[PDB]
Amino acid sequence: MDTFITRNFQTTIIQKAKNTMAEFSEDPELQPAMLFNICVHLEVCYVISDMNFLDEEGKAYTALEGQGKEQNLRPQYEVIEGMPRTIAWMVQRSLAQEHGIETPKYLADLFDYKTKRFIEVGITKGLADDYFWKKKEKLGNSMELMIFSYNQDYSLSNESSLDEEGKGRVLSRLTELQAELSLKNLWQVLIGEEDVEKGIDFKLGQTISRLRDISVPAGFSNFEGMRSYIDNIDPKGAIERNLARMSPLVSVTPKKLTWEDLRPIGPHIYNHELPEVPYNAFLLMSDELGLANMTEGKSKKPKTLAKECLEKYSTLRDQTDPILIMKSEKANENFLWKLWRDCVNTISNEEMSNELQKTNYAKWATGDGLTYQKIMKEVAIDDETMCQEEPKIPNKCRVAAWVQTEMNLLSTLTSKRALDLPEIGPDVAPVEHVGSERRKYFVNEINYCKASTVMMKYVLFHTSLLNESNASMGKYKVIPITNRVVNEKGESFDMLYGLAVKGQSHLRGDTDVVTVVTFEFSSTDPRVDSGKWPKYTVFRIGSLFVSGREKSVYLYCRVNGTNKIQMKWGMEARRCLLQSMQQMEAIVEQESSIQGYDMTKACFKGDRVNSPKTFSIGTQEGKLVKGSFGKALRVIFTKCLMHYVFGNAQLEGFSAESRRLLLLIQALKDRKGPWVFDLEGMYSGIEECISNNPWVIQSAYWFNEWLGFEKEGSKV
Amino acid sequence: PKYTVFRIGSLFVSGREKSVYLYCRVNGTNKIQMKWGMEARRCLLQSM
Amino acid sequence: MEMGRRIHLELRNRTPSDVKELVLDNSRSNEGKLEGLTDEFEELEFLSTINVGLTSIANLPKLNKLKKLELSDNRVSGGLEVLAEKCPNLTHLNLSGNKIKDLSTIEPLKKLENLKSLDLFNCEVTNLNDYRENVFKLLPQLTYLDGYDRDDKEA
Amino acid sequence: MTLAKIELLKQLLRDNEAKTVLKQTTVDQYNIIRKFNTSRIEKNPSLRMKWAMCSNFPLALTKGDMANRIPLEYKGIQLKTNAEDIGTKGQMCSIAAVTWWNTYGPIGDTEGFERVYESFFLRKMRLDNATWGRITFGPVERVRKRVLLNPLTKEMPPDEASNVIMEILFPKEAGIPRESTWIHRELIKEKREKLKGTMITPIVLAYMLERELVARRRFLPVAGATSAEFIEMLHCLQGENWRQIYHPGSRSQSMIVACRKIIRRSIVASNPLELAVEIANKTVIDTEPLKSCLAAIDGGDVACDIIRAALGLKIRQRQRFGRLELKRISGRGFKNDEEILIGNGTIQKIGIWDGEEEFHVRCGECRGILKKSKMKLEKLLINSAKKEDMRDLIILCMVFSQDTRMFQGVRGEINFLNRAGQLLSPMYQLQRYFLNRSNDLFDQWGYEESPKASELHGINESMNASDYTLKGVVVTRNVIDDFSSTETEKVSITKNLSLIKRTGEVIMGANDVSELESQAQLMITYDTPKMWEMGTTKELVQNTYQWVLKNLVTLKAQFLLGKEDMFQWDAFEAFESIIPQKMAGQYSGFARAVLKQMRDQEVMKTDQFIKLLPFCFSPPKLRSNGEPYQFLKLVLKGGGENFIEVRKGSPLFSYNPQTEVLTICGRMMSLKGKIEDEERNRSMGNAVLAGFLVSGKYDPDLGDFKTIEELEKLKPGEKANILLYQGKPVKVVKRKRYSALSNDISQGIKRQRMTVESMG
């Protein structure tokens, strides 16, 4: 309330009200409503006494402001309210003696020279008549009365004491105060000159009081006891008294951390007894075979594009006798081959519809019908064989070899570029010119790396999957894994990488799973490394010539499942690009901080004064190898892409917990002498995440190798 | 075409108000130009 | 607003021979004239015509009591000899801001002998060598000019 | 639609729930009612929008006649459907119709965008005309500061902003204009005229006005300029390791000077607070009282903070000592009186702070951290900002710390005063002594080895970045960011202008203000005679003419009566001080005669009336025969340019009737014309429902209510039945005057204190 008083009242009136409250020993802070009432009383008294003067004849009249008439300018009303009690009493007595009038037994508010009377001014929230009668009874007829209410009504002992303007102005001020209070919700809280002596009432019932009584710390028996104890008892070293007795077997166990303490994380990956990690990513990355058709540039529906792409390659389109290279463990060769044949027929059909024409064979090919039937709780309670499935923990695998090869291959330039970005407005400021130069130098590098093509393929596939799911809910659909690739000459090839059957996506929630089966063209015979493909049932659907060198063409078939969350994140996987640029930007900026000019050409290609910037990128035979700035940018972009594709709970738990060791190593390299409390705890936390994620296992392997390198290089 | 001009006030010479403008102009000159301006008093000798 | 409105406001719909001064300022005129002032005027002392777009002096009541006249911010460029035939009793002349080409424009004032002060500010004629001296010897009757004949006095 | 409104109301009331809720919840409670929505907010807006854009008709069109302009299917493309809706009760549509509307359809009005979205186009103008420069790739030092993100036409607090918005674009529901519309009358009328002639939905305009008025401030890392114009482009200008040169396409100094002058005027008298607040709320800067820029900026000079405390405003609770802004971090200092010998040999009894303490310290552009113990400074960390600021910070922190070395370093004498002639406490006397003679405690303070470290480097007594620094002082090559939690905690104001905390501790003292004079870059026009008897003659003439102009209505009304009471005004007494004594009486007589002739034998002429009125305060001295002396050139003190021309105009006063403008002391003011017509044009701002006061209840004797336009038709003193705010029928009376509550309160206080003194 005090804020409202400060805002709506002048400091002078507030000071007068505070002085009056002090004279009565009443605290303004503890009774803000009373302070507001006193301030309003003073303000209305001053407002009444203003502007009113008496002419030489003694007739009431108005006098202008800022325009004095010698000295006297006798005002009509002399304010008595607001003076110190002694001074107010003396002034009242002096006026009574001077004008020969009886001295009121009660101190007055104003005095009118014209009527030669003492006037009392009152305010109320109730009816003016009631307050007027109460005040008259308390004080009597010795003093004229003027009471105003907040509802635009008033009671005046004499109707000629105040003109229309004065009453209108006081009522306007009161109404404005009321409206402002209501806007601030203080109106209901506000309590008048008869209830302001009570205060807020909020008393606890019986059940809540009992709950408070039993919810007191140990050693107490009632909340009154706790309240008295807290208000009275003074601790003057209780902390030290408790510490002086607490057992010395509790402590942070502070141990200094040296290089030797750090050991490789997740030694079980090295062990060969465990199985090689399989390829669990949604789509093939370094094995995709692009059925490429040159196109003028027209963008067409994916179904028509796939139709045309197969039309160009009649041998693969019309292949109908498969050669099973391997049926993995559970999937049925007949189901997968018939489903793929239906896919090809639907794609190549004359009708634009891209929905499976069988609708019944796919139901068992995708395993939708192989689901349990839910019963009510009662039967489950009664039946004895309805147990609870044991949790299925992930397998503990070893370091594979395909992950490293894919990491290498996706991070190399290719003549084909797909990543294209929309234009932006002309750059007129120097800063945006520098930004444009840096952006061009970056895209000239990233665009031609195969990881960019894989990322665009993933984004396009997930966008198409989301569109199909939203449009089609309870019907099986056919979805080409399409991409668009522009070569250096500007030819806009359209690439078909395979097909996918989408199941029934009629799902209200987001976490609900929808099954999709992917058939992918590839040029890799899995028999070369069968450990990479234990989840895939494949055929050998023919061969093709790229330039005269015949190479086989297989179809990798696999059933999988996704959800709306991963489905959306597929189209948000483009942010990897941003993560690739930000850091490099920072790098370049750091260089610019050293020497004044801009180095984006120097770091990338070098200049006559500075050599090209080279990072440490790889290794061979125990010999670390450098790498150009562009290659390092490619490595970072591929790292981000893998952080996405192989991302799950294990990856998060691994990264967010190995960051501890990363920062500890960073501190050690700066000779900060970091100390640790429980190292084995951190190591266990980290290594309880290396179970079956290929990227997690390879990250652990690379971390161990890099830690070994840092250990060997720490000698200097 | 090369000056930036404001209007500051008005002077009175014979009881009549005449405006006053402030021609503000940027310029560039070197020390040798200062020497040339200083020697510009040679116009008296030239005319004589 | 028009010259007629100014005439009505100043005269307040009274007889023409009741005011010895006029204020025709910020008044649009037909093809640059000073219409609205009939020839019936007989008594006039002061005149004021500013921003009236007056292009020539060919319409003016014949008068014998006017002593001051004020023209400014006009594109008038023509012989002023007609003033002699209309009112050869001028003492204060103000052409400040007018458009006069050469000295010949101010020649016809020689035949007037009662003129004592002439004003010509930012005039194309004012930017000439010995314009002050040339005008002085061209109008011997002149006793004052833009303000610096020999001293500074006020009208 | 009003019939549709009443039919909908009747149908809604037909249900009992509507009847009971409507008759139960007052108008104020409506807010609560509105907030009881479903709150079934979409969990993922991206997925929802993606799905909706692929649906046949995701757009929710409002029912109306617009749809008939477009077929339900154009060129074989489905656009809109006639199926009913439950969520919005309208129709459905697709982005195809939106694109067609952008292609064809009705053509609207382009005028509204010229002014309605003024802020955006001003942003574009500032961008387009900006001039760019070089790029500095070197590291940039940035400080975290509270900066205004966007420029504001007139910064005001949120409540005043809302009230102004309502008074602008909501002519109805404008009960009892507060003491805020008169301050912003110019803004009210300008925005009202600009937005008139539009058809945009009112809520859009209200939100845009809120953006244009309500301030938006944030903590940002900045280096260099800090005005909102530069902050708009901070994303491009600044940079962690790069900087750009940018130049985007005043009142502050004037307010500083005015507040300092008010402080000095009020301090010398007794009960300074009331006099200071009277002058503050009676002052004006060219269009508005001082509560138009004081309330705009956050904090400011100590004088402005003290005045704001005297007025009603929020001030940052930083402790001002001289120029230092101090923010306590920890520790409690016990202020105990002690007798200490000063280096001059004298012994002074002053308050010393027992106990350790630490304060963030700021001074101009210098920031730092100070840690001090009783009778000793312990540590001081600073950043290199400016030599002058660094020296001021060092010296002021030295004096504040009350280090024994500082006392032992005194060599002169301490008997100084202020411009008002008062003896200050020994602390401020020492402050002034040391600031005047900086090289007094610096020499004998003692030196300390340089801060050997990676970045910590010392500074010598000369403020140069030289090693062998002062004992304790340290300069770190980093950024110190301080002054968090600007709570603006409750602060009291004593009569002597000195602020205090919620407790009895003193934060700002009356003598913190620095006694430095400047020149008001604006017309500082007061309204009280007491104030302006300090400055030059030109200032006196300007202020007297402004006083005359402001209350022109009252003076013009008194002129018709023709009584000498009009001339015996206190406002002209100060003018009497700048008129020669030997000749002022002749001026008074001449002006009185001229004005009597004006009243008798001619009609209104405001310019000459204003020019000639003020000189008549002094008594006349007529000619020996009795006739008044005649003049045409009123000379003023100082001679030369200090003179008034009776006929047309002079350097101090010139009115041109061709454009009807007034130039006083080299300042143009718009006298639209003459007449109560120009008076009412001046009143063209004000506020709807400003000429009517409230008196009585509904009073159905008048029948139905009447609009503002019909309200104006009523003659003064009538009674009318109107609706206040959202309903609330009341009876109002047309006003016969214009009111000023601050003036009434000030006069009441003056009478009260006159009575107190007379009895005393």
CB neighbours of residue A400 within 10 Å: 22
CB neighbours of residue D727 within 10 Å: 9
Q: Strand D473-475 and strand D376-382: pairing?
A: parallel
CB < 8 Å to D658, chain C:
25-26, 50-51
Return the structure tokens found at A583: 């850091």
Cβ-proximal residues to C51 (8 Å cutoff; 6+ apart), any chain: C25, C26, C27, C72, C73, C74, D658
Cβ contact A568–D46 (<8 Å): yes
Cβ contact B16–C147 (<8 Å): yes
Question: At what resolution in Å was this solved?
Answer: 3.5
Alpha helices, DSSP H, located in B1-48 = 31-39, 43-47
Say how far apart CA A78 and CA A151 lie, in whole Å.
28
Contact D458, D474 (CB under 8 A): yes
Give chain B's contact residues with D (Cβ, < 8 Å): 9-10, 12, 15, 17
Mutate to test the interface with A, among D497, D527, D544, D745 (most CBs of A within 10 A): D745
Return the structure tokens found at A59: 């007739």
- Interface subset of B 3-42, CB within 8 angstroms of C: 13-16
Which of the other chains make 3 or more beta carbon contacts under 8 angstroms with chain A? D
- Interface subset of D 571-630, CB within 8 angstroms of A: 571
CA pseudo-torsion sign A408, A414, A420, A421: positive
Mutate to test the interface with A, among D752, D756, D759 (most CBs of A within 10 A): D752
CB < 8 Å to C50, chain D:
658
Return the structure tokens found at D643: 């003179």
Q: Vertex D66, ends D63 and D71: CA angle to 5°? A: 105
Q: Which helix (H) or strand (E) holds B10?
A: strand B4-12
CB < 8 Å to D649, chain B:
17
Q: Vertex D238, ends D235 and D241: CA angle to 5°? A: 125
CB < 8 Å to C153, chain B:
14
Mutate to test the interface with D, among C23, C27, C154 (most CBs of D within 10 A): C154
- Structural Rg of chain C based on CA atoms: 16
Q: Vertex D544, ends D539 and D545: CA angle to 5°? A: 100
3-state secondary structure D311-329: CCCCCCCCEEECCEEEEEE
Mutate to test the interface with C, among B10, B16, B19, B21 (most CBs of C within 10 A): B16
Look at residues C113, C55, C61 and name the one whose alpha carbon lies nearest to residue C87. Answer: C61
CA distance A404 to chain D (A): 35
In whole angstroms, how far apart are CA D636 and each of C122, D645, D652? 33, 11, 10
Say how far apart CA D147 and CA D385 lie, in whole Å.
19
Say how far apart CA A507 and CA A485 lie, in whole Å.
34
The CA-to-CA distance between both ends of chain D, in Å, stands at 70
| Helix and strand element counts for chain C (H, E) | 3, 5
CB neighbours of residue C75 within 10 Å: 12
Say how far apart CA A468 and CA A301 lie, in whole Å.
12
Say how far apart CA A346 and CA A367 lie, in whole Å.
20
CB neighbours of residue A185 within 10 Å: 11
In whole angstroms, how far apart are CA D253 and each of A12, D260, D307, D517? 27, 11, 15, 11
The string of DSSP letters for D443-480 reads HHH-B-----SSS-B---TTSSS-SS-BSSEEE-SS--
Return the structure tokens found at C87: 């009112």
CB neighbours of residue A43 within 10 Å: 24
Cβ-proximal residues to C87 (8 Å cutoff; 6+ apart), any chain: C60, C62, C63, C64, C66
Alpha helices, DSSP H, located in D57-214 = 95-103, 112-115, 118-128, 158-169, 185-195, 202-213
In whole angstroms, how far apart are CA A8 and each of A13, A32, A40, A82, A173? 10, 14, 10, 18, 11
Cβ contact D176–A13 (<8 Å): no
E strands, D319-399, are: 319-321, 324-330, 334-341, 347-354, 357-363, 366-373, 376-382
Mutate to test the interface with A, among D26, D176, D279 (most CBs of A within 10 A): D176
Amino acid at D191: K
Tell me the β-bridge partners of C46: C21
DSSP class of residue A375?
A: -
Q: Residue D652's closest chain B neighbor by CA?
A: B10
CA distance D542 to chain C (A): 26
Contact A346, A357 (CB under 8 A): yes
Q: Which helix (H) or strand (E) holds A310?
A: helix A302-312
Cβ-proximal residues to D424 (8 Å cutoff; 6+ apart), any chain: D416, D417, D418, D432, D511
CB neighbours of residue D576 within 10 Å: 14
Look at residues A591, A584, A347 and name the one whose alpha carbon lies nearest to residue A478. Answer: A347
Amino acid at A165: E
CA distance D516 to chain A (A): 27
Say how far apart CA D288 and CA D290 lie, in whole Å.
7
3-state secondary structure D509-528: CCCCCCCCCCCCCCCEECCC
Contact C22, C8 (CB under 8 A): no
In whole angstroms, how far apart are CA D28 and each of A33, D170, D726? 20, 18, 10
- Structural Rg of chain D based on CA atoms: 33
Return the structure tokens found at A532: 């990479």
In our burial notation (b when 16+ CB lie closer than 10 A, e otherwise), range A322-349 reads beebbbbeebeeebbbebbebbbebbee
Q: Strand C68-72 and strand C49-50: pairing?
A: parallel
CB neighbours of residue D433 within 10 Å: 21
Look at residues D441, D438, D352, D355 and name the one whose alpha carbon lies nearest to residue D405. Answer: D441
Cβ contact D650–B9 (<8 Å): no
Q: Residue C51's closest chain D neighbor by CA?
A: D658
* Residue A121 annotated as part of some ligand binding site: yes
The string of DSSP letters for D678-728 reads HHHHHTTSS-TT-SEEE-SS--GGG-S---HHHHHHSPTT-EEEEE-SSS-
Say how far apart CA A13 and CA D749 lie, in whole Å.
9
Amino acid at A606: G
Cβ-proximal residues to A57 (8 Å cutoff; 6+ apart), any chain: none
Amino acid at A11: T
Cβ contact B17–D645 (<8 Å): no
Return the structure tokens found at A349: 């059909």
What are the respective helix, strand and coil percentages of chain B, to the nearest 5? Answer: 35, 35, 30
Say how far apart CA A655 and CA D537 lie, in whole Å.
78
Say how far apart CA D350 and CA A394 lie, in whole Å.
77
Cβ-proximal residues to A504 (8 Å cutoff; 6+ apart), any chain: A368, A473, A474, A475, A476, A514
Look at residues D721, D748, D750 and name the one whose alpha carbon lies nearest to residue D734. Answer: D721
- Structural Rg of chain A based on CA atoms: 44
Q: After which residues is chain C broken (C to N over 2.5 A)?
A: none
CA distance D527 to chain A (A): 8
Say how far apart CA D102 and CA D114 lie, in whole Å.
20
The string of DSSP letters for D266-311 reads HHHSSSHHHHHHHHHHH-EESSS-STTTTTTSSS-SHHHHHHHHHT
The residue count of chain A comes to 716
CA distance D96 to chain B (A): 53
Give the residue carrying structure tokens 């990355």.
A285
Q: Residue D645's closest chain C neighbor by CA?
A: C154
Farthest-apart Cα atoms in chain C, separation: 50
Contact A121, A109 (CB under 8 A): yes
Contact A179, A187 (CB under 8 A): no
Q: Strand D499-500 and strand D492-493: pairing?
A: antiparallel
Helix (H, G, I), strand (E, B) or coil at A647: coil
How many Cα atoms sit within 13 Å of A642 on the Cβ side? Answer: 26
Residue C51 forms contact with D (CB below 8 Å): yes
Cβ-proximal residues to A583 (8 Å cutoff; 6+ apart), any chain: A636
Q: Strand D319-321 and strand D284-285: pairing?
A: unpaired
Q: Residue C25's closest chain D neighbor by CA?
A: D658
Look at residues A131, A100, A632, A173 and name the one whose alpha carbon lies nearest to residue D739. Answer: A173
Cβ contact B15–D645 (<8 Å): yes
Contact A646, A695 (CB under 8 A): yes
Contact D510, D306 (CB under 8 A): yes
Cβ contact A592–D547 (<8 Å): no
Backbone torsions φ then ψ of D637, nearest 5 degrees = -60, 140
Q: Residue D659's closest chain C neighbor by CA?
A: C26
Helix (H, G, I), strand (E, B) or coil at D425: coil
Select from A153, A168, A590 the Cβ nearest to the Cβ of D241: A590
Say how far apart CA D633 and CA D646 lie, in whole Å.
6
Say how far apart CA D204 and CA A369 lie, in whole Å.
55
What are the respective helix, strand and coil percentages of chain A, to the nearest 5? Answer: 45, 15, 40
The string of DSSP letters for A105-166 reads SS--SEEETTTTEEEEEEEESS-HHHHHHHHHHHH-TTSEEEEEETTS-EEES-TTSS-HHH
Which of the other chains make 3 or more beta carbon contacts under 8 angstroms with chain D? A, B, C
* Residue A112 annotated as part of some ligand binding site: no
DSSP class of residue A528?
A: G
CA pseudo-torsion sign A420, A426, A432, A433: positive
Contact A410, A450 (CB under 8 A): yes
Cβ-proximal residues to A118 (8 Å cutoff; 6+ apart), any chain: A80, A92, A95, A96, A101, A104, A108, A109, A110, A111, A142, A143, A144
Cβ contact A91–D759 (<8 Å): yes
Residue D643 forms contact with B (CB below 8 Å): no
Return the structure tokens found at D541: 């003439």
Helix (H, G, I), strand (E, B) or coil at C23: coil
Say how far apart CA A646 and CA A410 lie, in whole Å.
15
Residue C24 forms contact with D (CB below 8 Å): no
The CA-to-CA distance between both ends of chain B, in Å, stands at 36
In our burial notation (b when 16+ CB lie closer than 10 A, e otherwise), range A225-243 reads ebeeeeeeeeeeeeeeeee
Contact A325, A525 (CB under 8 A): yes
Contact D269, D422 (CB under 8 A): no
DSSP class of residue D613?
A: G
In our burial notation (b when 16+ CB lie closer than 10 A, e otherwise), range A437-457 reads ebbebbbebbbbbbbbbbbbb
- Structural Rg of chain B based on CA atoms: 18
Contact D612, D655 (CB under 8 A): no
Contact D554, A64 (CB under 8 A): yes
Q: What interhelical angle do A450-471 and A564-571 show, nearest 10?
A: 130
* Residue A81 annotated as part of some ligand binding site: yes
Burial class (CB in 10 A: 0-12, 13-18, 19+), C28: exposed
Helix (H, G, I), strand (E, B) or coil at D404: helix
Return the structure tokens found at A670: 């700066």
Q: Which helix (H) or strand (E) holds D647?
A: none
Cβ-proximal residues to D180 (8 Å cutoff; 6+ apart), any chain: D156, D160, D163, D164
The residue count of chain D comes to 760
Cβ-proximal residues to A408 (8 Å cutoff; 6+ apart), any chain: none
Contact C83, C57 (CB under 8 A): yes
Contact C35, C60 (CB under 8 A): no
DSSP class of residue C46?
A: B
Return the structure tokens found at D554: 């009252």
Return the structure tokens found at D540: 């006196």
CA distance D577 to chain C (A): 29
Look at residues C40, C13, C35, C12 and name the one whose alpha carbon lies nearest to residue C24. Answer: C35
